[PDB]
Design an enzyme around this catalytic site. Sequence first.
Site, short mmCIF file in Angstrom:
data_model
loop_
_atom_site.label_atom_id
_atom_site.label_comp_id
_atom_site.label_asym_id
_atom_site.label_seq_id
_atom_site.Cartn_x
_atom_site.Cartn_y
_atom_site.Cartn_z
N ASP A 84 -12.92 0.56 -3.89
CA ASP A 84 -11.78 1.26 -4.21
C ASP A 84 -11.23 2.00 -2.83
O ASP A 84 -9.74 2.17 -2.76
CB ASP A 84 -12.05 2.82 -5.14
N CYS B 207 -2.40 -9.32 -5.84
CA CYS B 207 -3.26 -8.14 -5.78
C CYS B 207 -2.54 -7.28 -6.73
O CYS B 207 -2.16 -7.51 -7.66
CB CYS B 207 -3.69 -7.73 -4.48
N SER B 208 -2.19 -5.83 -6.41
CA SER B 208 -1.40 -5.10 -6.79
C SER B 208 0.23 -5.07 -6.67
O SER B 208 0.99 -5.37 -7.23
CB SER B 208 -1.81 -3.66 -6.87
N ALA B 209 0.42 -5.03 -5.29
CA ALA B 209 1.57 -5.06 -4.54
C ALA B 209 1.74 -6.52 -4.00
O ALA B 209 2.85 -6.80 -3.77
CB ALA B 209 2.00 -3.99 -3.18
N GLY B 210 0.51 -7.19 -3.95
CA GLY B 210 0.81 -8.83 -3.42
C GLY B 210 1.04 -8.85 -1.94
O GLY B 210 1.90 -9.69 -1.52
N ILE B 211 0.64 -7.85 -0.87
CA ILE B 211 0.90 -7.95 0.41
C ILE B 211 -0.44 -7.71 1.30
O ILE B 211 -0.75 -8.43 2.11
CB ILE B 211 2.08 -7.13 0.89
N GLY B 212 -1.27 -6.78 0.64
CA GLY B 212 -2.72 -6.61 1.42
C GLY B 212 -3.46 -7.71 1.35
O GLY B 212 -3.81 -8.72 2.14
N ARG B 213 -4.50 -7.42 0.23
CA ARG B 213 -5.34 -8.25 -0.02
C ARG B 213 -4.96 -9.87 -0.04
O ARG B 213 -5.80 -10.74 0.39
CB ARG B 213 -6.43 -7.99 -1.43
N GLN C 207 -1.73 -5.37 5.02
CA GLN C 207 -1.09 -4.13 5.07
C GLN C 207 -1.50 -3.02 6.19
O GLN C 207 -0.93 -3.00 7.21
CB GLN C 207 -0.91 -3.28 3.96
#
Length: 273
Positions: A180, A212-218, A256
């Site tokens: 988290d 992922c959630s925003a699709g930039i980090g992970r 990110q």
Amino acid sequence: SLRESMIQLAEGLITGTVLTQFDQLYRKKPGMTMSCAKLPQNISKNRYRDISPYDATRVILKGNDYINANYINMEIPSIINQYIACQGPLPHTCTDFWQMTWEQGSSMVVMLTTQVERGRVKCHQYWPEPTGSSSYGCYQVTCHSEEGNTAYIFRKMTLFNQEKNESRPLTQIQYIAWPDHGVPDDSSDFLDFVCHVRNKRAGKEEPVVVHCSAGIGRTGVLITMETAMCLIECNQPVYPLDIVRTMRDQRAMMIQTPSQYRFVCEAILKVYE
């Protein structure tokens, strides 16, 4: 040549130099339009106000037209890996998710998040529970298997198009052990996951969908790891700053945070040893 790139990377984490260099790289390629995501009709198909797709590389639905999703293609010098990097579906853009997957001929969907991290919905459950089916417009997903350890989950599904009376097989892999807060302490469970993603990708020539959630980090981490792993197989230098630049030319903001970059850089150096 590769060994030279990994001494520069190692002295850059000691040095503190690669975090510094990371902060210089642009997040949005200058002059690339992102103004569809801002059109009145499309605004609410975006999870965050400040994560939009480049007009120039967005994925275009045959409907009409819009999904938060970009083609990212990663060429290996001296293999061009195709991805569609996208946000996790919202409740109302689930049919768009499956429209994209069908139309681009993907057979693999890599999900890098759980549905609820902390007490927040990071992704909508856009697939049915095992033994189940659910309908998203003219597409019907039915899910046969759910097997996986405490780090990842493989789901075998059929995606069926009712408009074109046809069905393709489909495999989702979900990494369920991301903390988290921040980034994993040991990359060893993540690395294993990336290998699976590569075995099943195989020599297929269709985009692997990755969100992922925003699709930039992970999502940037995953693509940075798979790229780095072929660069190594071909005996090509590995410069994490330049892999992100190539990604960011194709979707804004890939990888990110500093911590995710540090994670990918330390990961690559542990994979090289």
